[PDB]
Amino acid sequence: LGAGSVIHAVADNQDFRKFGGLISYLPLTYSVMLIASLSLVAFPFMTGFYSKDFILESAYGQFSFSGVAVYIIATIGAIFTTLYSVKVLYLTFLSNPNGPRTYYRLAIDNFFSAQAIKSYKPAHEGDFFLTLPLVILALFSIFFGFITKDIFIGLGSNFFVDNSLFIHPIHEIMIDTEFAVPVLFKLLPFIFTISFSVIALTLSELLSELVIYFKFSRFGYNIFGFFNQRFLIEFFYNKYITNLILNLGGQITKI
Amino acid sequence: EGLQKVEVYERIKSLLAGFDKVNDPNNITETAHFANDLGLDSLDTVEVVMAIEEEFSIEIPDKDADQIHSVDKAIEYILRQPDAH
Amino acid sequence: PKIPYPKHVWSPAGGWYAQPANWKQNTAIFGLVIFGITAMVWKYSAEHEVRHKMPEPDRFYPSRYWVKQIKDYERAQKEK
């Protein structure tokens, strides 16, 4: 929804390559998306903190090979979660403008003689119907996690006592999730979140050179293209699944 | 409501006014040919087009990027396409 | 602006930029229908809502005033 008001501000553009600034232009829109992203990245003491973070301790609480194995996999995924979380915030909001003049040309500077009435349209925010849901979700994305933590998580909560969610004692990990896990692993995602973000803040608007150097290297060129194009999975889907169906149909109905 | 004659003429004027490679900002008019009137060459013309479409938020196809060689044609070409923001 | 469109194309959902001059009384006319059969649903729902655990009288309970399975039970419990 925060992105949706962004798209309405510009002429329905969706590319980051022509997004920037908009801090003064969309103050409310920036504020909510930061609130949402912080809960998305599991910033401590947020709605998403209790829900997203507990997983890793629950994953690590099950002291098995698989549980520890996916803890690394989840954490490295959480690391990249931070990266695009700031990428949306940086490129759209915390960066130099990259669109045309009309997105930012305010009325403070005259810049016009006979077209003062029109042609400004400097990417204003939406009306009440567009902003009210933003504010309503903003409160939930801050507090709703803490209020219901005992409701769902708790420690011995009896909310699910009509056999709605059945759990078998043979693989209980709730007590181990809070006690046996070392303190470092409990706060480890917090360490990575605050750390790996500032490198992105350092790599853009502070240096803005290492990322370009890494792009143009032959090893770095393909890793950008490979991940951009979705691991080529749809390529392997269209050519060898659906085009195959479309040719078996062709063989049957002609031969 | 849409783009007007005065909307495009002055707005495009502030673009090439920043050139340090034109003869002078006072040599641009409604019918300023990119080569004869103000000082530009065969390679600068496409560089202007790169600017025009970027600040008009449209595309200029290679077929129609060659008839465009004067500011007068720019006014009529853009008003032809209502895709302009 | 406004996209041009044919004026002959009858739509059940309305067409391109459809709004009648009487969009209010017609809205009111339809709104009565939704309410009318909602309580009609609510009546049947209130009559077939079956439960097995009874609530404490102290606790907040909005359904104590319309449902049958506990209204009879509550007055049956009011006999001692």
Place this chain on the structure above:
Amino acid sequence: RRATREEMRDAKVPLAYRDSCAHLLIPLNRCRYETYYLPWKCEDERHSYEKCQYLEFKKRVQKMEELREAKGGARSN
């Protein structure tokens, strides 16, 4: 005291918490029922329940001290 099945089953507590340490869990479940599970009214007895679990946990983990020693620090899982 320990909670027998006949009195503890009627409390309707989850299967994973049917342990002998759930004596203090029955009063804990009541307070959440009393105050809609708000996590700022049942603070006292919430800590009281975590007493028995924490004390039990240390007795449990201390048992590994001889258990994994008998295997010479081998892999128990």
Place this chain on the structure above:
Amino acid sequence: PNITGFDMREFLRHTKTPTYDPWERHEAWRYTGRFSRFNRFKGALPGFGIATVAFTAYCV
């Protein structure tokens, strides 16, 4: 290397703001007070400054 002069190192070396260029005047407005580095980060955390003042009051 190639028939056309194209060096990767020289191509990447020129990846910086040029000392001379015919395009600052059209691109100067971006690097002004409206979108300066200090002004862009002036409201990175909108309510952070106000919240701390109230936080210290609660402590005292």
Place this chain on the structure above:
Amino acid sequence: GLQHYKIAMDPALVRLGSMISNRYKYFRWTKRTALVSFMYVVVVPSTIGYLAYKTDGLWDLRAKRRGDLISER
């Protein structure tokens, strides 16, 4: 028999429909084409039929509890 609306009949589209309609008249037997006809008419259904025969009556889930087998043969 009635008349319809006016249509920009495309001869390329019109002639493409003629060939699809009349393709049956030009089929011939080739090394390739018998192999295609043989795979899809003979081999493939023979494969399903062989598997259906070989796994018929073999499984039944109806009320098999813990400690009993899905298989019946």
Place this chain on the structure above:
Amino acid sequence: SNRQAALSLYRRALKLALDWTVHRNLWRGQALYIRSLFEKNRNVTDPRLQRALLKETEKLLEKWKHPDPYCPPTAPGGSKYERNLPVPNLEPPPPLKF
């Protein structure tokens, strides 16, 4: 011939660079290297290598082609392209008994 297409390569050459480098002040100086590179081959006249020169550069555009170049929304490949299309035929249907 050999002139219309030559400008087309430069039309996309700096455009391709911008779609790789989001911070276009980096791209701003990037074009000057591209610009001066074109200026070096100024009075090349013989089509024998001039045609081959255009073939060679087209190879490296593909070698540096972006995974997804930028397009404006109201453009082929844009987001808003062919979104709200009016009917091609505004006149009402003629009197027919169907």
Place this chain on the structure above:
Amino acid sequence: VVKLTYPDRVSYPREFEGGLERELGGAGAVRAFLCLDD
């Protein structure tokens, strides 16, 4: 990498008095841990 270097389990399996035989569906069902091997 994780397989060669991953911590061993810390807590013992929970001990349930009576094995939860009755509450888990009787003898014809999966039971809890009660003085079994480890």
Place this chain on the structure above:
Amino acid sequence: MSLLYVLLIIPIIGIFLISTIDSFYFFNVSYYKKIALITTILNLIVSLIIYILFDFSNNQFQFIQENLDLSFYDIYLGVDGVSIYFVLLTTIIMPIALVSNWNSITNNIKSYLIIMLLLETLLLAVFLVLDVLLFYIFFESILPPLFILIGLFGSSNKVRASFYIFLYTLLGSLFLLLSILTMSSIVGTTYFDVLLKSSFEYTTQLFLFFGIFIAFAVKTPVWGLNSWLLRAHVESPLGGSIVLAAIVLKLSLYGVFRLILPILPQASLNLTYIVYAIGAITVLYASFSTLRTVDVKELIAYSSVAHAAIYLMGVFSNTIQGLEGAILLGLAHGFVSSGLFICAGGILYDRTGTRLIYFFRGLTQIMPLFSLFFFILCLGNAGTPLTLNFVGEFMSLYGTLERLPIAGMLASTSIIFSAAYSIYMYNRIAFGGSVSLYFIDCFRDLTKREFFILFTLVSFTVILGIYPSFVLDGLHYNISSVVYGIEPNASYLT
């Protein structure tokens, strides 16, 4: 007089009424359609009276008539659980088939109306006769009216289509006839009550199974024998196409409930792996080709081949769920197939004169009502829930799977592959652009005639999709009789 014989004669009054008015009143061609339409509504009323009297829990055939005048080939009529919904379907469809060609038939309107009214008498008699020789007498009698109907009111290649429907049916039936004749020489009769209680040697059952299955695999049609359907279901007039895909296709499915299941028990139980190989190969091949079909009518026709395999696998599943869902699938297929031909053959072909999907694109901009119904019909073809087509597919597939897991699984690909061609057809015609630019003339939307034959057809498939107990209730007791097998603890109770 039996209500069943009332069903067979009212169309004969209509034929006699239609042919003599010219001797009474240049009578307008509008009047004869009025008589033909009313005559079918009367059959619908009688069939509805019969259902309101029908008893859902009786083994004896109901609404029989005493004869006591035995000749060598008498006509006996009966209505039990399995055959009544087939009769009910026929009397519902036929009024809609005539309305679908209310304007499209121009020349020989008397001939078209007389054939269809005759065609109705012959089709009801198939589900009503009470012996297998009578079954064959009426299942092959439809060939001459169908032959002349196609070549008198058909599309450009009607001559080829009429020759294909006549020569495949005749050949398959002759193999069926050799089996029916063998049964009568063993049992001494064909009457259902006498013949059902006769058993047969295992070898006899195997050879009796073939001939009947040769016949029903041509008339199903299973893939590889389906070329008559693509010709005679496209080149036919729209009403004939509706009858050929809603009624004629379902005589073979019903012929399994009289000729294969109760009298060849051992033979069916051992030959299912052939049938499921043919059925799964049929689903699988008839889906891929209809994905590539350019004729819009041929795509709808050849999806019937895809669905007819699913309920063909459900009647050989020996499961009470499969057999019932098979009848439900062939009942729902009649509504959705009828509507789709109306959409393609009746609404597009009338306006455009063409059936090439190349010429159609984005009709939703101009035809909002047509797009609506053509979307529910496409969902029903895809077996989307809330549609009786879904319940029939689901119940047939469970029965097919429960009988042979690998075959039901290979049948279960239909969920993936029927939605593939039903929505690919929907987005190419209704969606996919503004409007096709080959239309040099804007199109009118659905008329009131079109809006009402589609509204009925999707009404039946939806109402019986929320509440299929209307059909399932009367099917239960009689379809119990066509199962074969016993349980160790429930057999031979003493």
Place this chain on the structure above:
Amino acid sequence: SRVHRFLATGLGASMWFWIFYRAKKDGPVLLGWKHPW
């Protein structure tokens, strides 16, 4: 339209205060310095 900025900072003021207020009590718990009791 200054009301938009007030909502921007007002939610921004509601946030960044819920953390320190909560870190004052729950902060020592997750750090392992002091157990919840």
Place this chain on the structure above:
Amino acid sequence: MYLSIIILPLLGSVVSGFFGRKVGVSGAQLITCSSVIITTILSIIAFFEVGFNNIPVTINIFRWIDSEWFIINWGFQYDSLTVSMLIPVLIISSLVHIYSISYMSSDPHNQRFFSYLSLFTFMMIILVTANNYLLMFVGWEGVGVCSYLLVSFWFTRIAANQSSISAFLT
């Protein structure tokens, strides 16, 4: 009450989509949003009643399929899980309904739009409130068709068409 939160989102959608001609753009919005809002308010009540007080409630309207051992009902069961499921579904659907009032005042077909989102809301309640797996499959396929109908909402987008196919077919 518990069967009402199933019917209301359905009722707004048919009036929005089949009589949207006769309620207009603003009427279609007011009817459907209110229906969602009303369904939202009763959903939070059920969460306070089903979960907090621990009373699951059963509704069995009538039979859907009845074949031998197979008796699937149009029946609905509220328990702790489905009230929790219905909170994010109903809070967000309402907000998105409000968010679309501003969003699509320029899109012509605005009352076919508001019916689809209220038709999506109906089938998500069906999915989570079922007694059984088969009725769940109604809300299952129902949201799938609602998604196709919304992905290709701008059906003159070829891109929306392929995307709608992919969503529907996958």
